[PDB]
Design a protein around this ligand. Structure first.
Ligand SMILES: NC(=O)c1ccc[n+]([C@@H]2O[C@H](COP(=O)([O-])OP(=O)(O)OC[C@H]3O[C@@H](n4cnc5c(N)ncnc54)[C@H](OP(=O)(O)O)[C@@H]3O)[C@@H](O)[C@H]2O)c1
Length: 284
């Protein structure tokens, strides 16, 4: 029984989904298919992961085998930096759509805050209004950048996908998003395992309390905040573990303990670091 959040346009999105970053293209079909069988419906990919084609094949099988209908799934993909523009953005979307073998996409995101994101958003608003995508949003946008879009365009981004985990908890940005009706979505909910997160003593003491794992506690913590989380694992047993978090609840005390862990900065790098902007823009 996986809860759904309601986005600013009335679209419902599952609060827990399945991420496919660093799953090799040739392993992505079986992973996604297994995830769906286990009960995932929110699937997160991107043009840049090079595994849309495998995601689409998993879906096609699940649908053909009767496991799900298309409407039960929530497929997210992303516009890569090098495609950002007006027509370039439509072309990119249509390329992803093809790879996925879908008629529509549930959520399409601007992947990075660089290049002509105003033209990309305008493009995206038009595909949104044409019915090609159910919800449009952004990724890795700080509040100033979110505001800039909001004051220059009609459609408020439905989602902003950003790094959120116990060591970068980003509460001030969450309340800015809640204020302006932008659903926060957590990428790297486990910080990709950085900083011995699965062995953190505070997290284990709370996990022990409930007979759950640390991973489960982290995801329960996010979702209990009203944050969509998209953990990634290539293991069937962890798919099952990661989705099995709604049969318990953290106390206020538990939530406050977890809050003490915030380090207030990325586990990876800052998007305001000019060297980072350049490194990202030079990947493709
Ligand atoms: N918008 C963006 O700029 C951006 C950037 C990065 C990622 N993302 C999205 O966010 C998704 C989630 O983030 P992520 O892949 O970076 O990192 P993540 O989900 O925080 O953590 C990934 C790691 O956790 C391990 N793991 C999963 N479940 C576990 C469990 N219950 N116990 C112990 N270890 C566990 C995985 O190992 P195994 O796979 O081997 O189990 C994997 O190495 C991505 O796949 C992608 O869809 C978006």
């Amino acid at each position: 029984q996986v809860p759904k959040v309601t986005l600013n346009n009335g679209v419902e999105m599952p609060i827990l989904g399945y991420g496919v970053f660093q799953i090799p293209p040739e392993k992505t079909e079986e992973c996604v298919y297994e995830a769906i069988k286990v009960g995932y419906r929110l699937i997160d990919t991107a043009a840049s992961y090079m595994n849309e084609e495998g995601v689409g094949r998993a879906i096609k099988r699940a649908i053909d085998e009767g496991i799900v209908r298309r409407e039960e799934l929530f497929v997210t993909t992303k516009l890569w930096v090098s495609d950002v523009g007006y027509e370039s953005t439509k072309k990119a979307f249509e390329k992803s759509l093809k790879k996925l073998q879908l008629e529509y996409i549930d959520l399409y995101l601007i992947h990075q805050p660089f290049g002509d994101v105003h033209c990309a958003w305008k493009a995206m608003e038009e595909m949104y209004k044409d019915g090609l995508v159910r919800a449009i949003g952004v990724s890795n946008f700080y509040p100033d950048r979110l505001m800039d879009l909001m004051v220059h365009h009609e459609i408020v981004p439905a989602v902003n996908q950003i790094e959120i985990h116990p060591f970068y908890q980003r509460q001030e940005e969450i309340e800015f998003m809640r204020n302006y009706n932008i659903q926060p979505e957590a990428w790297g909910p486990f910080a990709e395992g950085r900083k011995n997160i699965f062995q953190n003593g505070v997290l284990r003491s709370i996990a022990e309390k409930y007979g759950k794992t640390v991973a489960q506690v982290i995801l329960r913590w996010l979702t209990q905040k009203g944050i969509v989380a998209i953990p990634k694992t290539v293991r069937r047993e962890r798919m099952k573990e990661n989705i099995s978090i709604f049969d318990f609840e953290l106390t206020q005390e538990d939530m406050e303990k977890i809050a003490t862990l915030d380090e207030g900065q990325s586990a990876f790098f800052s998007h305001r670091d000019p060297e980072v902007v350049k490194w990202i823009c030079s990947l493709k």
